[PDB]
């Protein structure tokens, strides 16, 4: 009996959606000039990790980033001059995911062993010592993002994402509602909302205060590996394993513009934009990265050096220049 | 050029970079297994022999030692059903062992399409697989009772005969051993008709308390890197 | 966190000795250290480092060929060796530790000091203005400090540190790099400068302010400290 109900109720939101709809972004952006070809050649090689790179965070300076790496090892680099700043080991080798704090005092780091761990940078003795051990997830934890120096957010592979407290080490709100495990998360600028994305294509907004689902964005055919904002903080963008991007609006609940090729047929790992929404940067399996027109959607440029997968991608706060970690266990750095 | 303290960052970094060396050597030199099973067979107890010779974990570690060579094994503990994401990390593994429970015949269809899955996979390539048909005691009574036997869970029995190869030393009549190595042909069924030349699979009849156990993995091992090494060179 | 110094009394010219230096509270291995001495009535002067992992070295130009500076990390100890003590070398000696990487703070804790008695050059200068500030409580005072090279660096540091020395006590870090506070220096202080002039503020003095303040260069490995400046209440 329920579920006629939900089919009404699904039905009468698809018939709403489509009301609202009178043009499409092509038709409007139509008369504008192209952005002409982007030319990009690495700056920077860091080197040092044993295994391949899972993750990697730029630091609100942006001169320092950390990244993780599945030999059991997080490194904290320094970017202008590439010296090594801190080396940290941990006690699982599985690390798939890793934050940085805003301030600057904190790291986390967690993996296939469902803790999250929380290092202090600013000890008193000339070492980082473990601070915090969060437990409580039941399956491995794919995202975690950083809030205010005594609150967290984390998503796990058993369909829950979780905001924390650091202090108490129990955790305060609780986000269900998702049916596959959830693979990526992003802050909204005002963090006073995010979005998430799990394997069953499908994201969701949630607002942080209240604990509560506001909107539900279903336009996928496959399992969705990476999703962030628009800087303006009214759009974001997410990749999935269909080997295309979408983007998603939150004014009108609406999809915008599909990001996609004929000769593409692998999937999409990490989606990135610029300072001023223009570009969107995209990692992909077969060992490239590529940069669209995120306005008139039509590819603008490419990038190279990477002889394994692509696994994270992250543009600095500035928009000085972006960030690429692949398989390989190599860091490359590009203006 | 530099001041005077950027020196002693370069200094500390290479210090670093001295601590990195050695922990690659240590890092080079152990072999890391993947143990795979069900909650059927005695996967459980197969770590116990070796081990002995918190509260929502989700993985474990157990070390050994053959011969003077480290061993890892993992095995996954508090995890969901669905395996297709976390099953990417274990992609740079020496092996992957597999134990089977052949005793009972009312699941042996999931096991043979859980390791038809395992062997076609994107990611999983370029791995071998040690097989273990665990429990082989209790077949061989199951076969001589005769209440329950293979008549009607798979089609093409009766009509298979057994290979002029078998070495069935330990036995008490030639009935138990057609009906194992029958087991045995059916998985190694689905590993022939696949690609090969980059991995290959390695059958055991093993039992849940046995005393030789590491022994065979050293020996597999041993061959899976002689193999790679004959095959870098043209040699094979 | 604690250092401790042993070693000194009374000695005979031309004579030996031998300084130790212990630490406990921190991770020793990963610090640089420092010798810094003072004279009965007079300021202070950097004597030796020693760096991490021992592979650097520096000596003052005055004590080059008779003192010797050596770690002992397992059991967590510093050495210094004097050899052929003059006249000169009746000084009270001071341990300090430093961390350089990018951020850090050197110079960020300093040990209590040892006693030691004897019997009968292109090099950066600092000054200081005065050696005297008759204040009030409550009111605002203002120190300077110059220099004869321009501090600046081509990167963007300036390398300028401002220490205090309370009266019977050991010297503490303040300012680093010329617009940082301490870990926990109260707020009050502050510090500017354009290069070549610096000057430290303070805005609502209180009792506690009275001592010697001391500024200092680490832009060259000649290390100058200066006369420094007396507060009275």
């Known amino acids: 009996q329920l579920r006629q109900e939900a089919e009404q109720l699904k039905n009468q939101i698809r018939d709403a959606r489509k009301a609202c709809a009178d043009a499409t972004l092509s038709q409007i952006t139509n008369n504008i000039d192209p952005v002409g070809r982007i030319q990009m050649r690495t700056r920077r090689t860091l080197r040092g990790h044993l295994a391949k790179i899972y993750a990697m965070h730029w630091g609100t300076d942006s001169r320092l980033l950390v990244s993780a790496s599945q030999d059991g090892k997080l490194i904290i680099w320094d970017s202008y001059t590439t010296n090594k700043v801190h080396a940290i080991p941990l006690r699982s080798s599985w690390v798939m995911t890793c934050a940085y704090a805003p301030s600057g005092n904190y790291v986390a780091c967690g993996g296939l062993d469902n803790i999250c761990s929380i290092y202090n940078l600013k000890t008193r003795e000339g070492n980082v010592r473990v601070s915090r051990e969060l437990a409580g997830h039941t399956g491995y934890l794919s995202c975690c993002r950083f809030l205010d120096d005594n609150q967290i957010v984390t998503s796990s592979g058993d369909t829950t994402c979780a905001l924390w407290d650091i202090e108490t080490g129990q955790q305060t709100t609780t986000f269900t509602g998702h049916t596959g495990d959830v693979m990526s998360l992003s802050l909204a600028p005002d963090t006073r909302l995010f979005v998430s994305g799990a394997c069953d294509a499908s994201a969701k907004l949630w607002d942080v205060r209240e604990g509560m689902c506001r909107q539900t964005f279903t336009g996928h055919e496959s399992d969705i590996n990476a999703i962030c904002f628009f800087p303006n903080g009214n759009a974001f963008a997410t990749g999935s394993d269909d080997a295309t991007c979408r983007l998603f609006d939150l004014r009108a609940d609406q999809e915008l513009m599909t990001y996609s090729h004929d000769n593409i047929i692998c999937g999409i790992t990490s989606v990135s934009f610029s300072k001023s929404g223009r570009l969107l940067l995209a990692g992909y399996d077969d060992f490239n990265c590529n940069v669209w027109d995120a306005l008139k959607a039509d590819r603008a440029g490419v990038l190279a050096g990477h002889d394994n997968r692509v696994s994270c991608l992250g543009v600095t706060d500035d928009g000085m220049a972006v960030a690429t970690g692949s398989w390989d266990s190599f860091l490359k750095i590009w203006n | 050029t530099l001041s005077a303290e950027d020196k002693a960052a370069v200094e500390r970094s290479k210090m670093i970079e001295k601590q990195l060396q050695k922990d690659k050597q240590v890092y080079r030199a152990t072999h890391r297994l993947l143990l795979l099973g069900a909650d059927n067979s005695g996967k459980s107890t197969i770590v116990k022999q070796m081990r002995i010779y918190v509260k929502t974990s989700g993985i474990f570690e157990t070390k050994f030692q053959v011969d003077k060579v480290n061993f890892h094994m993992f095995d996954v503990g508090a995890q969901r059903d669905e395996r297709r994401k976390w099953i990417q990390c274990f992609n740079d593994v020496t092996a992957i062992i597999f134990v089977v429970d052949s005793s009972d015949y009312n699941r042996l269809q999931e096991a043979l399409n859980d390791f038809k899955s395992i062997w076609n996979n994107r990611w999983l390539r370029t791995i071998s697989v040690i097989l273990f048909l665990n429990k082989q005691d209790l077949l061989a009574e199951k076969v001589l009772a005769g209440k329950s036997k293979i008549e009607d869970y798979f089609p093409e029995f009766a009509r298979y005969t057994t290979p002029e190869d078998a070495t069935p030393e330990p036995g008490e009549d030639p009935r138990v051993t057609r009906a194992k190595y029958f087991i045995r042909d059916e998985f190694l069924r689905i590993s022939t008709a696949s690609g090969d030349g980059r991995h290959y699979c390695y059958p055991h009849f093993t039992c849940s308390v046995d005393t030789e156990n590491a022994r065979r993995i050293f020996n597999d091992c041993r061959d899976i890197i002689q193999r790679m090494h004959l095959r870098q060179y043209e040699l094979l | 966190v604690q250092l401790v110094e042993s070693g000194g009394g009374l000695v005979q010219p031309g004579g030996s000795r031998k300084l130790s230096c212990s630490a406990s509270?921190?991770?020793?291995?990963?610090?640089?250290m420092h010798w810094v001495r003072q004279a009965p009535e007079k300021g202070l002067e950097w004597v030796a480092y020693?760096?991490?992992?021992?592979?650097?070295?520096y000596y003052a130009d005055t004590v080059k060929g008779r003192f010797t500076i050596s770690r002992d990390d397992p059991k967590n100890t510093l050495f210094l060796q004097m050899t052929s003590l003059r006249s000169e070398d009746t000084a009270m000696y001071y341990c300090?530790?430093?961390?350089?990487?990018?951020?850090?703070?050197?110079?960020?804790?300093w040990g209590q000091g040892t006693t030691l008695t004897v019997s009968a050059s292109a090099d950066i200068v600092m000054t200081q203005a005065t050696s005297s500030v008759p204040v009030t409580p409550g009111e605002s005072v203002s120190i300077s400090c110059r220099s004869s090279?321009?501090?600046?660096?081509?990167?963007?540091?300036?390398?300028l540190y401002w220490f205090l020395q309370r009266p019977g006590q050991s010297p503490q870090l303040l300012i680093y790099?010329?617009?940082n506070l301490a870990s926990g220096v109260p707020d009050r202080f502050s510090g500017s400068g354009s290069g070549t002039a610096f000057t430290l503020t303070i805005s609502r003095l209180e009792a506690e302010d009275v001592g010697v303040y001391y500024c200092?260069?680490?832009?060259?490995?000649?290390?100058?400290f200066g006369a420094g400046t007396k507060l009275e209440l």
């Open positions: 200092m260069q680490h832009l060259e490995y000649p290390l100058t």
């Open positions: 020693i760096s991490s992992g021992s592979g650097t070295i």
């Open positions: 300090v530790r430093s961390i350089y990487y990018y951020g850090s703070s050197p110079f960020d804790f």
């Open positions: 790099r010329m617009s």
């Open positions: 509270g921190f991770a020793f291995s990963s610090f640089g």
């Open positions: 090279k321009s501090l600046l660096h081509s990167n963007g540091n300036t390398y």
